[PDB]
Amino acid sequence: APKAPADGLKMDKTKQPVVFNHSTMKAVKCGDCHHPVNGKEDYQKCATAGCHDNMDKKDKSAKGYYHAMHDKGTKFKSCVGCHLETAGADAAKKKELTGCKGSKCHS
Ligand code: HEM
Ligand code: HEM
Ligand code: HEM
Ligand code: HEM
C-alpha cells in the first residue's frame, strides 16, 4: 500500500499556498481523501490533469480545485467541510480550522 509522505507538504497551485501535514489527520482513513475514482482509491496529486485541474475558484464541477478544498455538501468531505464538523459550535476551533484568514490554513 502507498505510504504517507512527510509532513510539511506544500499545496501551491494558487497564490494562497497551504501546508498539509498527514500526521495531524492520521485518524482519517487514507481513502477518505485519496478517494475512489473508477472504483479505485486514487493517490495522484489532486490537481492532476483530468482531476481537479480547473483553477477558476467559482467552478463547482468535479474539476474545480477550490471547490474540492472549501465547499460543503460534497460527496467526500472537503478540507473545510470536515473541519466544520470537527469544530462544531466551538468558535475558536472554527477560526483555527475554517477561518479564511488567520487560520491554520491561511495566515
Ligand atoms: C493514509 C495512510 C494516506 C496515504 C498512504 C497517503 C498518501 C499520499 C501520497 C502518496 C501523497 C503524495 C502525492 C504526490 O504524488 O505528490 C499524498 C498527498 C496528499 N494527501 Fe495523503 N495519504 C494518506 C492520507 C491522507 C488523508 C487522511 C488526507 C486527507 C485528510 C490526505 C490528503 C492529502 C493531500 C491533500 C495531499 C496533497 C496532494 C496535492 O495534490 O497537493 N491524505 N498522500
Ligand atoms: C486529492 C487529495 C484530492 C482531493 C482533496 C479531492 C477531493 C474531492 C472532493 C471533495 C470531491 C467531491 C466534490 C463534490 O462536489 O461532490 C471530489 C470528487 C471527484 N474527484 Fe477528487 N480529490 C482529490 C483527488 C482526485 C484525483 C487524483 C482525481 C483524478 C484522478 C479526482 C477526481 C474526482 C472526480 C472525477 C470526482 C467525482 C467522483 C464521483 O462523483 O464519484 N480526484 N474530489
Ligand atoms: C484538505 C486538503 C485539508 C487541509 C488543507 C487540512 C489542513 C489542516 C490543518 C492545517 C490542520 C491543523 C493541524 C496542522 O497544522 O496540520 C488540520 C487539522 C485537522 N484536520 Fe485537516 N485539512 C484538510 C482536510 C481534512 C479532512 C478531509 C478532514 C476530515 C475528514 C480533516 C480533519 C482534521 C482534523 C480532525 C484535524 C485536527 C483538529 C484539531 O483541532 O487540531 N482534515 N487540518
Ligand atoms: C474561508 C471560507 C476561506 C476562503 C475564502 C478561502 C479562500 C482561498 C483562496 C482565494 C484560495 C486561492 C484560490 C485561487 O485559485 O486563487 C484558496 C486556496 C486554498 N485553500 Fe482556502 N479559503 C478559506 C479557508 C481555508 C481553510 C480553512 C483551509 C484549510 C482547512 C483552506 C485550504 C485551501 C487550500 C488547500 C488551497 C489551495 C492551496 C494551493 O494549492 O495553492 N482554505 N483559498
Swiss-Prot record:
Coiled coil: none annotated. GO terms for molecular function: electron transfer activity; heme binding; metal ion binding. Binds 4 heme c groups per subunit. GO terms for cellular component: periplasmic space. Heme c 3 binds at residues 25, 79, 82-83. The second and fourth heme binding sites have unusual CXXXXCH motifs. This is Cytochrome c3. It comes from Nitratidesulfovibrio vulgaris (strain DSM 19637 / Miyazaki F).
